[PDB]
Design a protein around this ligand. Structure first.
Ligand code: HEM
Length: 151
């Protein structure tokens, strides 16, 4: 469980993210797709993209980054009490989109990297550690729902 001090670190950097949700979502998805090309393939919307420049030029990719980061921000602000927010997400991701937990680990890495690049002064090691714990908690809870569903 995260402590109150850890949640404060998480939400302090997250408030910086929310000044530019779309730009952060672009950066995160591009990093994910470049670092882990199998993830791109899960998106019929995006698997035509062949280059970073094409990814950066795609308005639809920017829209999905907003969708993803909006959902994550709503989860983070629940400070662990995110059961209702995870139910639909775990269901769609296990049974429709088919996103392994490992791919959630990869996007978590991408989130952390982009937050460190964009917000170094608010993303020292303490805050990195807290955000890693928050994203682990997310993954843990989704994983339990996947297991229930046999995914
Ligand atoms: C922080 C982690 C993530 C969050 C919060 C998140 C959130 C969302 C949301 C809110 C939606 C739309 C509602 C829904 O279908 O449930 C969605 C759709 C989707 N997401 Fe996730 N997502 C995350 C990670 C990923 C990863 C890592 C992948 C792939 C590697 C992925 C693949 C997809 C796909 C394929 C869709 C459907 C897109 C479409 O065809 O419109 N997501 N996601």
């Amino acid at each position: 469980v995260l402590s109150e001090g850890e949640w404060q670190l998480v939400l302090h950097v997250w408030a910086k993210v929310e000044a530019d949700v779309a730009g952060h979502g672009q950066d995160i998805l591009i990093r994910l797709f470049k670092s882990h090309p199998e993830t791109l393939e899960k998106f019929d919307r995006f698997k035509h993209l062949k280059t970073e420049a094409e990814m950066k030029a795609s308005e639809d990719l920017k829209k999905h980054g907003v969708t993803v980061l909006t959902a994550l921000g709503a989860i983070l602000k629940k400070k662990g009490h995110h059961e209702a927010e995870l139910k639909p997400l775990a269901q769609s991701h296990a049974t429709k989109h088919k996103i392994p937990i490992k791919y959630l680990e990869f996007i978590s890495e991408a989130i952390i990297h982009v937050l460190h690049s964009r917000h170094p002064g608010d993303f020292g090691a303490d805050a990195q550690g807290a955000m890693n714990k928050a994203l682990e908690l997310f993954r843990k809870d989704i994983a339990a729902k996947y297991k229930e569903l046999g995914y």
